[PDB]
Amino acid sequence: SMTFGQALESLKRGHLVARKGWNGKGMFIFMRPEDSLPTNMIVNQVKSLPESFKRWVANNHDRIKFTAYLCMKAADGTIVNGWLASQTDMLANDWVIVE
Amino acid sequence: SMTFGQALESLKRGHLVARKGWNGKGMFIFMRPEDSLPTNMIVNQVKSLPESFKRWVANNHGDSETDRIKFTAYLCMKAADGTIVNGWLASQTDMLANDWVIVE
Numbered sequence: 127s128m129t130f131g132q133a134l135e136s137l138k139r140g141h142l143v144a145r146k147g148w149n150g151k152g153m154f155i156f157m158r159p160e161d162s163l164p165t166n167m168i169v170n171q172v173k174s175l176p177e178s179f180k181r182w183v184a185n186n187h188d189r190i191k192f193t194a195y196l197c198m199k200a201a202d203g204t205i206v207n208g209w210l211a212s213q214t215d216m217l218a219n220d221w222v223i224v225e
Numbered sequence: 226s227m228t229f230g231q232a233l234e235s236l237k238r239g240h241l242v243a244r245k246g247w248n249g250k251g252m253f254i255f256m257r258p259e260d261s262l263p264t265n266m267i268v269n270q271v272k273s274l275p276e277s278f279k280r281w282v283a284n285n286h287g288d289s290e291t292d293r294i295k296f297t298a299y300l301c302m303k304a305a306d307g308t309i310v311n312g313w314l315a316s317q318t319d320m321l322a323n324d325w326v327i328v329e
């Protein structure tokens with residue numbers, strides 16, 4: 127069992143990790159890597175972007191960079207983009223590799 | 226100006242919002258809506274997923290057309306350096322402030 131810092135190194139290597147002390151069942155987090163897209167892709171191709179964002183991009187622009195980030199497979203089976211580490215998650219040492 | 230609760234209502238309506246008290250300049254946040262995807266598409270047609278996750282989906286749903294995985298809505302930030310951050314989070318000060326404004 128490991129610290130949050132070790133779990134973050136395993137996430138950057140592509141593993142799934144979880145805390146034993148979480149309330150929800152069968153959950154895990156994983157990392158999604160950075161991506162860089164031409165601005166035309168963003169305005170015409172990328173799904174799930176608001177029109178207001180797309181207009182700002184068109185108005186202010188080569189390439190747009192999406193930073194890497196963490197995600198969660200939740201207890202209900204949903205995927206949450208943008209998982210949050212609580213105070214307890216960050217300071218705990220009950221992290222485990224789950225895949 | 227507005228409370229975070231009002232900013233959240235405008236985000237759900239498709240607006241861009243920002244706090245006047247943020248340190249970085251020219252920033253804003255926006256909402257990306259929930260989506261529902263077929264599980265076969267998650268295994269081979271979605272970029273930016275690790276193999277370990279694709280393997281998990283393949284093991285727990287299989288080669289299925291009917292089966293779908295729901296991605297919930299979430300907030301994103303256009304940062305000070307121009308990068309886009311999927312999964313913006315609200316600090317204590319963000320949550321309790323009343324200096325929110327609409328930017329678009």
Ligand SMILES: Nc1ncnc2c1ncn2[C@@H]1O[C@@H]2COP(=O)(O)OP(=O)(O)OC[C@H]3O[C@@H](O[C@@H]1[C@@H]2O)[C@H](O)[C@@H]3O
Binds near residue numbers: 151201
């Ligand atoms: N000891 C604790 N300290 C700080 N916050 C805690 C907490 N216990 C629960 N919470 C939070 O309060 C809400 C309901 O919690 P739960 O639904 O019971 O969450 P859980 O299944 O334990 O998953 C854990 C994941 O949920 C998120 O934090 C939750 C979630 O916002 C965060 O991303 C975490 O990694």
